[PDB]
Amino acid sequence: MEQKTLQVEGMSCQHCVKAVETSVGELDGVSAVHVNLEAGKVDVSFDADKVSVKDIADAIEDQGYDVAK
Amino acid sequence: MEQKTLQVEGMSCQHCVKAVETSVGELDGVSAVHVNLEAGKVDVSFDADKVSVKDIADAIEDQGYDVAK
Amino acid sequence: MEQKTLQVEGMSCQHCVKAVETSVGELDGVSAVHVNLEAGKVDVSFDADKVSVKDIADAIEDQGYDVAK
Ligand SMILES: [Cu+]
Ligand SMILES: [Cu+]
Ligand SMILES: [Cu+]
Asked: Which residues form the HMA domain (chains A, B, C)?
């Protein structure tokens, strides 16, 4: 169970950020996630054996935002 | 039939504000509502016998914004 | 096949702009469109015989943004 601060560009709407939190949440592995709209940050916590950042990032880019690598 | 200027924080998108206007609109009581994205204001008008601010606020917070009390 | 820079006000969310690109895209005539969120611009390219700016604008205003005439 790790905790990471993904750097995210492009998030600007409090309503739409709700969907970020929701899709990264529906990922097995994901024990929690909280989107910090103003820091462009998606601090996440999870089971590193059950999901990867790659998916998580992938689930973040499918909303259309940019995950810094 | 009253007219109130709800103070709202978090609204930033012209497209998403459309949904605010729409859900507070579908509330029985609600004779009209207009969202002022730049003043963070949801001036509403309604039948005070047929719906409360509480719901209205509630319908605004379900979009994810913050109704000042 | 023309290429136009529609001036657009109101676009602010990278996620929601995705829907702009998508609906103007589903228009017969439309060979491409790219939304420039920061310039408030919707540079489009199309077959002038198969769709008009009017629709395109119309498809942009249905998202709730303002097409400068
Ligand atoms: Cu939004
Ligand atoms: Cu939006
Ligand atoms: Cu959005």
From this structure: 2-68
Q: Is C62 on the interface with B (CB under 8 A)?
A: no
Are the C-beta atoms of residues A40 and A61 closer than 8 Å to each other?
Answer: no
For residue B60, what is the domain's CATH number? 3.30.70.100
Q: Do B13 and A17 touch (CB under 8 A)?
A: no
Residues on chain B touching A13 (C-beta within 8 angstroms) = 12-13, 16
Residue C28's SS3 state is coil
> How was this one solved?
X-ray
Closest by CA to A29, choosing from A13, A54, A10, A52, is A52
Instruction: Show the DSSP H helices in A26-65 as ranges.
Output: 53-61
How far is Cα C2 from Cα A17, in angstroms, rounded to an integer?
Answer: 36
Nominal resolution (angstroms):
1.9
Strands A2-9 and A66-67: antiparallel
Strand order from edge to edge, sheet including B2-9: B30-33, B41-46, B2-9, B66-67
Number of folded domains in chain A?
1
Q: Using CB atoms, which chains have 3+ pairs under 8 A with B? A: A, C
Shortest-distance ligand to the CA of residue B64: 1
Containing structural domain, residue B55: 1-69
